[PDB]
Design a binder for this molecule. Structure first.
Ligand SMILES: Nc1nc2c(ncn2[C@@H]2O[C@H](COP(=O)(O)OP(=O)(O)O)[C@@H](O)[C@H]2O)c(=O)[nH]1
Ligand SMILES: [Mg+2]
Length: 150
């Protein structure tokens, strides 16, 4: 049973993503099967930033691909985590991939941010439910790898 914190600037789709996962701040629970093994995830959509950051088994940092300011905020959030948790899995998410015409952050900028962070990167669309199940399965897989590389 794993606690997952959603972090990111206002308006990026944290609540959208969480409500889709929950099948529905606020909290969501849900058991899912990942590589043949059941896992429960508790998703905290609660973004006292220090307290929030002190608390997860994994961190999902969300920005909107339509909002370069939210992508900058993602880098700021990562620096903060580095100070707050001085091992934890982090997934970077570029949401709103359906809004092709208003895109402000390229896929390659997202990928580059992943290299700097040394973390996994995925783009999502809460509007289309695209990559939402993959995001949360990835969370589970990344937590397991870190339980086991020990
Ligand atoms: N088109 C589109 N709109 C989205 C997507 N995700 C969130 N939104 C919209 O983005 C705005 C903020 O979403 P919300 O879940 O409240 O974001 P939060 O502030 O990060 O929790 C709302 O207008 C949502 O409908 C997406 O993937 N595609
Ligand atoms: Mg919200």
């Amino acid at each position: 049973v794993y606690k997952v914190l959603l972090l990111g600037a206002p308006g990026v789709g944290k609540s959208a993503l969480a409500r889709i996962f929950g099948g529905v701040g606020h909290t969501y629970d849900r058991s899912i099967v990942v590589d043949g093994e059941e896992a429960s995830l508790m998703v905290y959509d609660i973004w006292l930033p220090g307290h929030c950051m002190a608390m997860g088994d994994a961190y999902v940092i969300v920005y909107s691909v339509t909002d370069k300011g939210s992508f900058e905020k993602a880098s700021e959030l990562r620096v903060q985590l580095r100070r707050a948790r001085q091992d934890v899995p982090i997934i970077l998410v570029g949401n709103k991939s359906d809004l092709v015409r208003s895109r402000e952050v390229s896929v390659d900028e997202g990928r580059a941010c992943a290299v700097v962070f040394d973390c996994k990167f995925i783009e999502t669309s809460a509007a289309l439910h695209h990559n939402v199940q993959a995001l949360f399965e990835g969370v589970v897989r990344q937590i397991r790898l870190r339980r086991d590389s020990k």
